[PDB]
């Protein structure tokens, strides 16, 4: 996928002013195929010398620690991909009991039982940050998640296919091709937050 692609697919729907319309016509811009399959359903911010813990949609857990190193446990609850600083991926199970690697898994450990306990609401997170207004989450299969503290709205930016699925205040979960934006319009709400996705794709690209 790619950042660079993000970036362009939300300046040109943000230069469209979807917002900006006689009539918007929101419902015709809604793309049932780009319906994404992965995001981050959880997340923990312990980025205090541990790291950073989150769960998919689909129950897999990750936590990307402070070393830059990722560890990722599938929702088998047994497979995990552990990434090398340097990018490099192996393959071991949390059964097999791996001597270097037994802090983490604790880590983990905690980290998914901290979420299915006390937090509602394969593709790894390459980084993240925080901005007082949000949580930016990108996935090493190109998406990128904004979630917005104040609101709980969450957008998922999925440039394979230059599409954004937004998780209203309702919790609606709607997902938008970006040029169909561009054609039929959208709230003020989504146009500003597309807004506030494309400063947060710069920074994300500007690392």
């Known amino acids: ?8 697919q939300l300046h040109s729907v943000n230069a469209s ?6 009539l918007v016509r ?8 780009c319906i ?36 990722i446990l599938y929702n088998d ?13 192996s393959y071991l199970t949390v059964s097999s009991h791996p ?11 905690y980290f998914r039982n901290y979420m299915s ?9 390459r980084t993240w940050f925080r901005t007082r207004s949000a949580i930016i989450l990108h996935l090493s299969n190109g998406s990128v998640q904004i979630n917005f503290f104040q609101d709980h709205t969450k957008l998922i930016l999925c ?21 169909l934006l561009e054609e039929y319009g959208c709230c003020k709400e989504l146009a500003s937050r597309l807004r506030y996705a494309r400063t947060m794709v710069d920074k994300l690209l500007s690392s």
């Open 77 to 89: 609850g047994d497979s995990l991909q552990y990434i090398e600083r340097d990018g490099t991926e």
């Open 17 to 22: 002013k979807p917002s900006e319309r006689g």
């Open 159 to 179: 440039p394979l296919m230059a599409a954004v699925t937004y998780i209203d205040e309702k919790r609606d979960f709607r997902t938008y091709r970006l040029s």
């Open 36 to 71: 994404p399959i992965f995001w981050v359903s959880k997340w923990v911010d312990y980025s205090d010398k541990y790291g950073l813990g989150y769960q998919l949609c689909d129950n897999s857990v990750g936590v990307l620690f402070n070393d830059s190193t990722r560890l």
């Open 117 to 125: 306990e006390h937090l509602l609401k394969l593709p790894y997170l």
């Open 1 to 8: 996928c790619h950042l660079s692609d993000m970036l362009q």
């Open 26 to 33: 929101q419902e015709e811009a809604e793309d049932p195929a």
């Open 99 to 109: 001597n270097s690697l037994m802090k983490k898994i604790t880590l983990l450990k």
